[PDB]
UniProtKB/Swiss-Prot annotation:
GO terms for biological process: signal transduction. It is found in: Cell projection, Cilium, Photoreceptor outer segment; Membrane. Belongs to the arrestin family. This is S-arrestin. GO terms for cellular component: membrane; photoreceptor inner segment; photoreceptor outer segment. Changing residue 673 to A: Abrogates tetramerization, reduces dimerization, does not affect binding to microtubules and to phosphorylated light-activated rhodopsin. The keyword Ion transport does not apply. GO terms for molecular function: opsin binding; phosphoprotein binding; spectrin binding. Residues 487-494 are annotated as: Interaction with RHO. Keywords: Cell projection, Membrane, Phosphoprotein. The modification Phosphothreonine is found at residue 706.
Length: 833
């Protein structure tokens, strides 16, 4: 209060200055020295402040120098016999008014006032003000004195109110001079220079010219191209719609008002403009939150690519709109208010004026805390854990150079995503926070404009980073902006220069050693002249759509890759197979062999079954042998010519081993909370390795010694899908299940054998079911049980599969039913042909 009074009146000067008297004075009238030496002023200043100030002190240090004057002056008041009784009689507010008089004029000046101090002591306010107004002090500084004189009369701080309050608005300017008029009626040129209103008109023009085409084109291009319309882009499309609301609802209205210099549309127009401006900004904000969440879950976990259909994307866009309306609507319906901010041209949320009628305190806290901290925590956690996962994954296999380029591009974008987010919302949050902590201080119209500059700029530069810098949207917009443009077997290329040959598609995987790829490649001498032909082995994990995944941040992960040269070779092949010799003799002179081997740490060819409604969803591992021609040296694999290249997929299939494992026989006992009797259960199977389409007799044996009755006995052939890509993520699912209606009595034993037949036909139309890798959309069978080599060095990435018979006993216990269950593992694989 008192500090804010004297700061407005005397004026807070930070550096050392010579006052009207010509003495070295610092801060709010805080004297330093009477000597003509400047270093003498520095001497007392440095000692008082406590550091090398060099004349320059902080605003808080000037506040402490002022508080020392407050303490010293108050002591001086109590020392004086005329001032002490008046100080004691008056309240805290009028005491501060007296201190203002004692500050400038000194004890000497204030001591001379006989009549006023008598009347002030006698609780006569009006005639005291009349006497004070008729003095030298009012003549000296009528600006300062008039404010203090009114304070003595009223006993309130109304004279010291920073701006000019109103029914539907708040102007940050003093009406003491008598120039303030309504922003909904008259011009506001008294706030700032007229050319700055033209600057605002030029600025809003720039936002419309840049903002509308970018966001409209985003939607227009999406309507044309089928490629873009995918669930992940749904949230990016919502961002485009949000920014369009900021243009049409916000900037165009602000442009019209900035030209005139005041808000012409009135309170109704201010509510609607501020509503769309907030809605556009908030939908844009929560769109980026959802985008961060989506990109974290979808990339790190490959299973979620299937999960994320249109309905989940709609929920993300819905949540965005709900959170936006949750904070945009209350200003209309009482909680806070939309008023003209800054220059009283743009309408926005009232986060400066504390009005308990509309409850701004609770609203600014609710908004600030929720809408700032929750995105900050979620987005930094999302992209933070994303980069954390990718950097650790990139370090796991440094041999793959393709992953390193991705990891680099990713980290570069994530740094820019953070910078764009902070530059956008930190100005508003920091200023709103600083205004809340320092409420007594004044804030100009241009001061409130600085956050508005960066936030409305985000309407432009967010589409740049999230849409324009996006790889798919960049190439799609390129098309629209430029008007539509810019037995042994083989496979021939498109240009028909290179022709690959392979003996078989299905390559076998024995536990010890993998059966290698063998074949040849025919080449045209005339077409391939002064070029380098490479035969390449590639193992790849695929998840999601091909175009969309490259665009988001980083693309599908290759489990293993190995390229090999062919024409011309370093020497030749060491020794040839019967296949290569046969092909060389059959084919002409321009045939060159290759031998590509698999290491021991790779998975099998496994895909996951989609639902019939899932038209555009696919995830699965597959092997690809590819051959191509190129002008560039070895490391230019990352990019390839589409025309010269030819690719033919293969499988790393595992047949069942000749010797069967031990006969599975699991056993487990149970107890209960009241009854301490044992319930012994023992399971047993026929084989360790079952084959596809084979009956599985599960000879369950249950010996009941407990008081409780069992309701039923259910057996289930459960497929555990262990998916590993970034982290180890198991996924259990049932395949086949049969249950008996028989009941086991107390002190009674039972021996039953239930047969189960796991088949693909019965398990059709189900999401998440792992299958053996298809060649070309043909019919297949349930996924084979994956086998891993003993005590290997590297971890096995990819989709690992395993089966287990899970018997569960529905026990009728004390209406409530207890469900105990146990598992036993087994294998489902193809037989040796």
């Amino acid at each position: 209060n008192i500090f804010e009074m004297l700061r407005i009146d005397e004026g807070l000067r930070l550096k050392i200055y010579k006052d009207t008297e010509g003495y070295y004075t610092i801060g709010i009238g805080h004297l330093l020295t009477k000597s003509p030496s400047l270093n003498a002023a520095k001497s007392e200043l440095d000692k008082a402040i406590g550091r090398n100030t060099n004349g320059v002190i902080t605003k808080d240090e000037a506040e402490k120098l002022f508080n020392q004057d407050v303490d010293a002056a108050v002591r001086g008041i109590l020392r004086n016999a005329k001032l002490k009784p008046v100080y004691d009689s008056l309240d805290a507010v009028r005491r501060a008014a007296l201190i203002n008089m004692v500050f400038q004029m000194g004890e000497t000046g204030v001591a001379g006032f006989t009549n006023s101090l008598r009347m002030l002591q006698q609780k006569r306010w009006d005639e005291a003000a009349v006497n004070l107004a008729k003095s030298r002090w009012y003549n000296q500084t009528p600006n300062r004195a008039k404010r203090v004189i009114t304070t003595f009369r009223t006993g309130t701080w109304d004279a010291y109110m920073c701006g000019t309050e109103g029914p539907n608005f708040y102007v940050p300017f003093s009406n003491a001079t008598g120039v303030v008029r309504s922003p909904f009626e008259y011009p506001q040129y008294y706030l700032a220079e007229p050319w700055q209103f033209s600057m605002l008109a030029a600025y809003m023009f720039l936002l419309i010219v840049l903002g509308f085409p970018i966001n409209f084109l985003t939607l227009y291009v999406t309507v044309q191209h089928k490629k873009l319309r995918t669930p992940l882009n749904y949230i990016l499309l919502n961002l485009a719609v949000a920014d369009l609301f900021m243009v049409l609802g916000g900037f165009t209205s602000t442009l019209y008002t900035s030209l005139h210099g005041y808000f012409v549309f009135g309170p109704t127009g201010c509510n609607l403009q501020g509503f769309f401006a907030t809605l556009g900004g908030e939908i844009a904000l929560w769109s980026l939150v959802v985008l961060a969440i989506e990109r974290y879950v979808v990339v790190c976990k490959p299973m979620s690519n299937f999960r994320f259909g249109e309905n989940h994307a709609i929920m993300g866009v819905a949540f965005t709109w709900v959170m936006a309306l949750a904070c945009a609507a209350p200003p209309l319906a009482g909680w806070s208010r939309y008023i003209p901010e800054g220059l009283q041209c743009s309408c926005g949320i009232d986060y400066y004026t504390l009005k308990p009628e509309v409850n701004n305190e609770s609203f600014v806290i609710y908004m600030f805390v929720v809408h700032f901290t929750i995105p900050m925590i979620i987005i930094f956690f999302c992209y933070g854990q994303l980069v954390f996962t990718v950097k650790e994954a990139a370090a796991q296999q440094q041999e793959s150079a393709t992953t390193q380029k991705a990891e680099k591009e990713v980290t570069r974008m994530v740094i820019i995503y953070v910078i764009a987010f902070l530059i956008c919302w930190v100005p508003y949050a920091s200023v709103a926070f600083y205004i809340f902590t320092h409420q007594g201080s004044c804030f100009g119209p241009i001061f409130m404009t600085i956050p508005a500059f960066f936030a409305k700029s985000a309407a432009i530069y967010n589409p740049v980073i999230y849409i324009m810098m996006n790889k798919q949207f960049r190439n799609c917009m390129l098309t629209t902006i430029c008007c539509g443009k810019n037995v042994i077997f083989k496979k021939v290329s498109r240009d028909k220069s290179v022709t690959i040959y392979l003996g078989k598609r299905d390559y076998v995987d024995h536990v010890s050693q993998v059966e290698p790829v063998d074949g040849v490649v025919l080449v045209d001498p005339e077409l391939v002249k002064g070029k380098k032909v490479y035969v390449t082995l590639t193992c790849a994990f695929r998840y999601g759509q091909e175009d969309i995944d490259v665009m988001g941040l980083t693309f599908r992960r290759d489990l293993y890759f190995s390229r090999v040269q062919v024409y011309p070779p370093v020497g030749a092949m060491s020794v040839l197979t019967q296949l290569q010799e046969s092909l060389l003799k059959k084919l002409g002179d321009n045939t060159y062999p290759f031998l590509l081997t698999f290491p021991d740490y790779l998975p099998c060819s496994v895909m996951l079954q989609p639902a019939p409604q899932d038209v555009g969803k696919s995830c699965g591992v597959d092997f690809e042998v590819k051959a191509f021609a190129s002008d560039i040296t070895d490391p230019e694999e990352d990019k390839i010519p589409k025309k010269s290249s030819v690719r033919l997929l293969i499988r790393k299939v595992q047949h069942a081993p000749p010797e069967m494992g031990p006969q599975p026989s699991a056993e487990a006992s149970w107890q209960f909370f009241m009854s301490d009797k044992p319930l012994n259960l023992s399971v047993s199977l026929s084989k360790e390795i079952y084959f596809h389409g084979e009956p599985i007799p599960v000879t369950v044996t249950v010996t009941n010694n407990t008081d409780k009755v069992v309701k039923k006995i259910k057996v289930s052939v459960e497929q555990i899908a262990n998916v590993v890509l970034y982290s180890s993520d198991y996924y259990v699912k049932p395949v086949a299940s049969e249950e008996t209606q028989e009941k086991v009595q107390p002190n009674s034993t039972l021996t039953k054998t239930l047969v189960l037949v796991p088949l693909l036909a019965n398990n059709r139309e189900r999401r998440g079911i792992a299958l053996d890798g298809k060649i070309k959309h043909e019919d297949t069978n349930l996924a084979s049980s994956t086998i891993i080599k003993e005590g290997i060095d590297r971890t096995v990435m990819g989709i690992l599969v395993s089966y287990h018979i899970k018997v569960k006993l529905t026990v009728s216990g004390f209406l409530t039913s207890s469900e105990v269950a146990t598992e036993v593992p087994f294998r489902l694989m193809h037989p040796q042909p």
